[PDB]
């Protein structure tokens, strides 16, 4: 009934800029993650990730980013 993936909004955060393509590539290596697209804003990045089976931090840890964008949610 309900979606099979979620959708959440990261924030690209690094000391050195970087293309999407590299960002792409860090979270396709991680399981867990579906998509990956850069959108027309201010450094944001919107992912379809399955919160169920991927850890927030395994995230942050291939790239430092913030990994929070404005306005999102969280269930706990």
Known sequence: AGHMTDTLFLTVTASLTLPWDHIQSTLLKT???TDIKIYP???????????????????????PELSLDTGTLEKK
């Open 41 to 63: 804003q201010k450094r944001t990045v919107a992912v379809t990730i399955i919160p169920s089976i991927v850890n927030a931090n395994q995230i942050k840890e291939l790239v």
């Open 31 to 33: 399981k867990g993650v």
